[PDB]
mmCIF file of C-alpha atoms (C1' of nucleotides) in Angstrom:
data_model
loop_
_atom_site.group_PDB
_atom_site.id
_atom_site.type_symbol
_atom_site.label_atom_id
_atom_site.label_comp_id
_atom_site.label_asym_id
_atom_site.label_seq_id
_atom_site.Cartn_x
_atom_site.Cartn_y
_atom_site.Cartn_z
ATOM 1 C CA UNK P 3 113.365 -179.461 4.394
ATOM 2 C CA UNK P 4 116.132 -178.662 7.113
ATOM 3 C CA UNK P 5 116.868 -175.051 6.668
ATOM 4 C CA UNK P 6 118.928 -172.948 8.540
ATOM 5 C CA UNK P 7 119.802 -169.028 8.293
ATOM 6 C CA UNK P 8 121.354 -166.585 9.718
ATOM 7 C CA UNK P 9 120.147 -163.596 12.106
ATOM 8 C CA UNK P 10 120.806 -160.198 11.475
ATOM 9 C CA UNK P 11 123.806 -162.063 8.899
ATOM 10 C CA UNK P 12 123.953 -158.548 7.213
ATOM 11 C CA UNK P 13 125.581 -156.615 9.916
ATOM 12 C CA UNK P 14 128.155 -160.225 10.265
ATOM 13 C CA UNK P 15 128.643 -159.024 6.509
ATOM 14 C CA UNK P 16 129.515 -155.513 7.594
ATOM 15 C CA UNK P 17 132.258 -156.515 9.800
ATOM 16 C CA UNK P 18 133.531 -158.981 7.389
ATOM 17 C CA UNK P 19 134.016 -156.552 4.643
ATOM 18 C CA UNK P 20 136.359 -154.587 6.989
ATOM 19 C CA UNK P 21 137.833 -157.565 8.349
ATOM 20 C CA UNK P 22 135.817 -158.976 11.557
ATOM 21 C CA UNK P 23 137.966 -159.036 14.997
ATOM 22 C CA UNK P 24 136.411 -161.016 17.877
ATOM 23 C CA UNK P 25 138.404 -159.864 21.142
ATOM 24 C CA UNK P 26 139.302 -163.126 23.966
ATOM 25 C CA UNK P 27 140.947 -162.721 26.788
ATOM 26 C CA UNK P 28 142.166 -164.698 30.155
ATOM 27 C CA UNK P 29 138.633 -165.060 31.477
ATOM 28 C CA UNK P 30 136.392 -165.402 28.446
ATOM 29 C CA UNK P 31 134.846 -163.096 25.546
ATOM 30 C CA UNK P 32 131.315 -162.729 24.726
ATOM 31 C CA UNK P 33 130.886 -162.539 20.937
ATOM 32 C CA UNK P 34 130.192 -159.595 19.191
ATOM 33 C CA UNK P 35 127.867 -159.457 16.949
ATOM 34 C CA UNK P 36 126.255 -162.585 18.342
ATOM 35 C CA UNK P 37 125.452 -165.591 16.110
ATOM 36 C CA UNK P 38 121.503 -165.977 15.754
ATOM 37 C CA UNK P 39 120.025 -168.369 13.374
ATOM 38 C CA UNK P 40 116.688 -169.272 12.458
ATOM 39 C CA UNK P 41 115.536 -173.038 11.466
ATOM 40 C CA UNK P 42 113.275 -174.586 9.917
ATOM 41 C CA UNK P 43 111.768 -177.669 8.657
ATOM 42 C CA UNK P 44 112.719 -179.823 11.647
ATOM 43 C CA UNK P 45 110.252 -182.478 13.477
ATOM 44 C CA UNK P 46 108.089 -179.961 15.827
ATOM 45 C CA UNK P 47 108.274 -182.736 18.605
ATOM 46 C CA UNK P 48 111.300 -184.288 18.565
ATOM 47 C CA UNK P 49 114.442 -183.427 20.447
ATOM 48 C CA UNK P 50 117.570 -181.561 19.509
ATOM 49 C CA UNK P 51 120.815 -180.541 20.975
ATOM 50 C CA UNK P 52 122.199 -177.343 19.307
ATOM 51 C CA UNK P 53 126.074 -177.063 19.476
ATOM 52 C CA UNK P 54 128.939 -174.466 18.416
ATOM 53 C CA UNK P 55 132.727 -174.679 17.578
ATOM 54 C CA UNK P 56 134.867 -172.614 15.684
ATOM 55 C CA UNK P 57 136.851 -173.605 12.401
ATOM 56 C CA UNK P 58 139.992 -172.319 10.958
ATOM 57 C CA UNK P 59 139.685 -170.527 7.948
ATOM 58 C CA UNK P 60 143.022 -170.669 6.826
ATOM 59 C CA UNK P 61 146.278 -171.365 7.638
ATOM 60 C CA UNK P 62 148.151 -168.277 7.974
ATOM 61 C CA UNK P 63 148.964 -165.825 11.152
ATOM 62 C CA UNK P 64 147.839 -162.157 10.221
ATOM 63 C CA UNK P 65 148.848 -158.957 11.808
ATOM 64 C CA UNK P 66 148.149 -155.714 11.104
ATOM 65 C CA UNK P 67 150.110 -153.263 9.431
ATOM 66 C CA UNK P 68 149.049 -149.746 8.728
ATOM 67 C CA UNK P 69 145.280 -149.654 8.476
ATOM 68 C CA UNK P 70 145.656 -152.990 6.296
ATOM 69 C CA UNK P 71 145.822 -157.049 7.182
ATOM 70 C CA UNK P 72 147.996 -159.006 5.779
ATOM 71 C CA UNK P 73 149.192 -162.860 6.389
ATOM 72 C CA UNK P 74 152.311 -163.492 8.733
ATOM 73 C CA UNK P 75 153.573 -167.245 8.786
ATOM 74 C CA UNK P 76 153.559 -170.164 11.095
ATOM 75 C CA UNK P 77 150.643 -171.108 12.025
ATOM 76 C CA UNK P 78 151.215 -172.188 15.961
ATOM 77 C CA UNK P 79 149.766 -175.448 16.408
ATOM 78 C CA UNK P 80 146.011 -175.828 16.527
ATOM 79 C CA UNK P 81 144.063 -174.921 18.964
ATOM 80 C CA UNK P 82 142.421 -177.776 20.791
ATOM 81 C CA UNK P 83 138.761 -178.752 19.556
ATOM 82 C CA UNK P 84 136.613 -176.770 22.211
ATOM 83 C CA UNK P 85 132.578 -176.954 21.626
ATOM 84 C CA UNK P 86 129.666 -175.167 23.579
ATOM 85 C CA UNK P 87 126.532 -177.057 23.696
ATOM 86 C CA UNK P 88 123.749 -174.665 23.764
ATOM 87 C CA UNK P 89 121.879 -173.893 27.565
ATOM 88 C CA UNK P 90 118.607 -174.407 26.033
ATOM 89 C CA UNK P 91 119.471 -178.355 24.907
ATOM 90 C CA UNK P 92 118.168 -180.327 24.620
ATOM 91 C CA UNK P 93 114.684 -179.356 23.636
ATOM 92 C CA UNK P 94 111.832 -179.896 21.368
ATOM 93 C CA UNK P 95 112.109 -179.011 17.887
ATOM 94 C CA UNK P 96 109.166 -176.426 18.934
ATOM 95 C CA UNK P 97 111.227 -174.472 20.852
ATOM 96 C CA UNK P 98 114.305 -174.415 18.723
ATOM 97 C CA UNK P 99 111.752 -173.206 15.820
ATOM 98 C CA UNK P 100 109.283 -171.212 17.548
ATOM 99 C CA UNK P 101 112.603 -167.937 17.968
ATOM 100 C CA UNK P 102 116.112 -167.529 16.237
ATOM 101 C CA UNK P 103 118.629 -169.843 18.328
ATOM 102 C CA UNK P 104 121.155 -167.320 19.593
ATOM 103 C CA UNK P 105 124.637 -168.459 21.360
ATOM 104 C CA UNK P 106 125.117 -165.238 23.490
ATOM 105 C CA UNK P 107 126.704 -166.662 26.390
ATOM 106 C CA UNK P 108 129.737 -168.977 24.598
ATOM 107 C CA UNK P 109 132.603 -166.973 26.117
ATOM 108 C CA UNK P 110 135.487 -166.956 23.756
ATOM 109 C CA UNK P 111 139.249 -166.888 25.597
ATOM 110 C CA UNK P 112 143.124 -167.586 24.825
ATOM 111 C CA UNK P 113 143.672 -170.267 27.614
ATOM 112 C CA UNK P 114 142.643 -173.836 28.409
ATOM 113 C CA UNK P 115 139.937 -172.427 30.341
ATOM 114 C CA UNK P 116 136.664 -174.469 30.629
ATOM 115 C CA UNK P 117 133.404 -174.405 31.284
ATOM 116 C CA UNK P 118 131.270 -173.522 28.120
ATOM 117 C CA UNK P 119 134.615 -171.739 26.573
ATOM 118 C CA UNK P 120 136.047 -171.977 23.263
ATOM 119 C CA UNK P 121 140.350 -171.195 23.208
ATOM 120 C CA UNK P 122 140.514 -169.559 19.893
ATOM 121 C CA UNK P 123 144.666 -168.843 19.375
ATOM 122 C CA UNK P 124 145.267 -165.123 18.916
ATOM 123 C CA UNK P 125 145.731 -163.385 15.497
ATOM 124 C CA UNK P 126 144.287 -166.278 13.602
ATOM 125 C CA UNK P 127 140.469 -166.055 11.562
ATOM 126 C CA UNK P 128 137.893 -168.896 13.052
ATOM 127 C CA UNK P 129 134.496 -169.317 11.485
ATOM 128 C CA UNK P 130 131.750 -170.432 13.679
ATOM 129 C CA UNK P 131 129.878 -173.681 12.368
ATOM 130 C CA UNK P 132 126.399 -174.755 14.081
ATOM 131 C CA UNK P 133 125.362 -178.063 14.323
ATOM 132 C CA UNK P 134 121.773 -179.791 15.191
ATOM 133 C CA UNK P 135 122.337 -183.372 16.951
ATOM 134 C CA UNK P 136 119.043 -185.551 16.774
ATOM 135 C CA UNK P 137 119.776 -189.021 19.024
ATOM 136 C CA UNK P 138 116.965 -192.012 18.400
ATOM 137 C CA UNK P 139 117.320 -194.496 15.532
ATOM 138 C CA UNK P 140 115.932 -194.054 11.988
ATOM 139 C CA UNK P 141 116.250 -190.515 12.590
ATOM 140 C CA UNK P 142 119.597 -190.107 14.383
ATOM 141 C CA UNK P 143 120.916 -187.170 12.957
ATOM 142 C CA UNK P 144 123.555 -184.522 13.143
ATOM 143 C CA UNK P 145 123.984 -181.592 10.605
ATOM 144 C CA UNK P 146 126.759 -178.520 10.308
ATOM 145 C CA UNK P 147 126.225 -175.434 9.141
ATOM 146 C CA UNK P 148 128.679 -172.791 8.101
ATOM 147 C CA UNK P 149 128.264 -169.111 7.539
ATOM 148 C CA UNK P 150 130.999 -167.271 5.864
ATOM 149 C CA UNK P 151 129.529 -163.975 6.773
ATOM 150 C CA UNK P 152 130.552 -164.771 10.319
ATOM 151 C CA UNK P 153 134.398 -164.537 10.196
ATOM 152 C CA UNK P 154 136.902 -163.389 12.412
ATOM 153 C CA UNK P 155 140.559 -162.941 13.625
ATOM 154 C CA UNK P 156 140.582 -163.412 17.031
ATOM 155 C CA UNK P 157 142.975 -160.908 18.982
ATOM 156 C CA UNK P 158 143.456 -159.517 22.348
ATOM 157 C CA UNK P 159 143.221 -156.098 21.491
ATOM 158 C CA UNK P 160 140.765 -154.282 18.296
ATOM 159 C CA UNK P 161 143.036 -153.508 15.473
ATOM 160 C CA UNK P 162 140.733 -151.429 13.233
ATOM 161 C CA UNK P 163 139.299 -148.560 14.135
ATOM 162 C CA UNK P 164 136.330 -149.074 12.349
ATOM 163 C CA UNK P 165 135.887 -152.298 13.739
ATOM 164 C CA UNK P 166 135.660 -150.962 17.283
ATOM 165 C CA UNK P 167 133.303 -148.123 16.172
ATOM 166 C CA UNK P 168 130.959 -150.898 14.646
ATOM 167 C CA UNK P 169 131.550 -152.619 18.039
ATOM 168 C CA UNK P 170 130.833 -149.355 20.111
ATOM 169 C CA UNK P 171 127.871 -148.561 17.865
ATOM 170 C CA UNK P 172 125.780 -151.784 17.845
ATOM 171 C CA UNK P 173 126.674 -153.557 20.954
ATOM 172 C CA UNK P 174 124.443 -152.214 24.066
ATOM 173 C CA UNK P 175 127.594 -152.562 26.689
ATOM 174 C CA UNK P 176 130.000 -150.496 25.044
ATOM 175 C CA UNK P 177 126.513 -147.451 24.629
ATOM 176 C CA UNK P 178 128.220 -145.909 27.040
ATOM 177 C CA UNK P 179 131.362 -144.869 25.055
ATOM 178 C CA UNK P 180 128.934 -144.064 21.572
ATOM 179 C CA UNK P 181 128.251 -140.804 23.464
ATOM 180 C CA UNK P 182 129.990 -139.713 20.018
ATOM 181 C CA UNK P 183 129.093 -135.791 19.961
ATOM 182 C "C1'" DA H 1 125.396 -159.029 38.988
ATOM 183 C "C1'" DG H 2 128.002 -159.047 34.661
ATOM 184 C "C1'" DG H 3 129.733 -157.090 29.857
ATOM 185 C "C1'" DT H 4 132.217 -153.133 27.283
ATOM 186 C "C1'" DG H 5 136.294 -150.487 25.446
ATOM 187 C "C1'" DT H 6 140.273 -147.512 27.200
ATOM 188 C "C1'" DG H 7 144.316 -146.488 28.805
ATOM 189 C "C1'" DA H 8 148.313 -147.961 31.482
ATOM 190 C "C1'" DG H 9 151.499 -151.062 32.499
ATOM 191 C "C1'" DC H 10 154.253 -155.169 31.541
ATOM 192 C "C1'" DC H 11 157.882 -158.156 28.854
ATOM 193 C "C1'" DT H 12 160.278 -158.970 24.629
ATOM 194 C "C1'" DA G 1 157.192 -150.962 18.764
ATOM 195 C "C1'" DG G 2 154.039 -155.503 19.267
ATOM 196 C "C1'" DG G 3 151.388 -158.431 21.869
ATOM 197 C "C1'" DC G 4 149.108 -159.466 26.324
ATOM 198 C "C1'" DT G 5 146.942 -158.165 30.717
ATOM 199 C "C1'" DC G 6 144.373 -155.660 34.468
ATOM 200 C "C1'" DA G 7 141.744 -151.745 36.893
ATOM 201 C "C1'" DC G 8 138.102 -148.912 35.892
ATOM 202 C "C1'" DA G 9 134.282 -146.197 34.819
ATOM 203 C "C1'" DC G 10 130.751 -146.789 32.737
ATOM 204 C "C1'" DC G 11 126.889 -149.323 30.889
ATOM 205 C "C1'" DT G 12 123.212 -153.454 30.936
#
DNA sequence: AGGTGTGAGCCT
DNA sequence: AGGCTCACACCT
């Protein structure tokens, strides 16, 4: 039937064992890594929307405190639902199938700032959770998808080292500071 | 054009 | 210190 997995979810693994950190700021973050998925088992020819949002995944503040995370308190109040609808959308089940559906563009930020962005509220963990929409009758249709592997605080500012060498190492716009000799 | 971390600078 | 922001030199 429907199925739907995760790209490269091994390295999202790798950054969640060490805690994963997803940096906003004023004018929007890109994601890093960035959530692919592949799917499967949907109608070739019919049309789907693909859209994102972000999902608390608990209800604590964190901070940082040496080399190790651990909760604060008060969680400030929710951030407003934000979603990003995918570019591609809507499109033919064909297309959505025929390559892993990446969402490299959604900018992530810490302000009411619009236009494909998602406010995430800073030193809290968000999970991303896909969803397929399918508009028509018999098969009207919308499905969620959660993968744990993709947690994250989100913070202005990397807290773990290793985090940000994971960040320099795999991400192609920070190559220029892996010139680690 | 447009994304990346790093320092530096800022207020509390 | 503790969190947020902005120029900047790199990269894509």
């Amino acid at each position: 039937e429907l199925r739907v997995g995760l790209e490269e979810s091994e390295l999202w693994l790798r950054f969640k064992e060490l805690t994963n950190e997803m940096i906003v700021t004023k004018n929007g973050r890109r994601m890093f890594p960035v959530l692919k998925v592949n799917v499967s088992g949907l109608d070739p020819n019919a049309m789907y929307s693909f859209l994102l949002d972000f999902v608390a995944a608990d209800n604590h503040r964190w901070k940082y405190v040496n080399g190790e995370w651990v909760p604060g308190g008060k969680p400030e109040p929710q951030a407003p639902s934000c979603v990003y609808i995918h570019p591609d959308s809507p499109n033919f089940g064909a297309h959505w199938m025929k390559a892993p559906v990446s969402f490299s563009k959604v900018k992530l930020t810490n302000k009411l700032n619009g236009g494909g962005q998602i406010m995430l509220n800073s030193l809290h963990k968000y999970e991303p959770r896909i969803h397929i929409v399918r508009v028509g009758g018999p098969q009207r249709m919308i499905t969620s998808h959660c993968f744990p592997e993709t947690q994250f605080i989100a913070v202005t500012a990397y807290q773990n080292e290793e985090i940000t060498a994971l960040k320099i190492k795999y991400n192609p716009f920070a190559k220029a500071f892996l010139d680690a000799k």
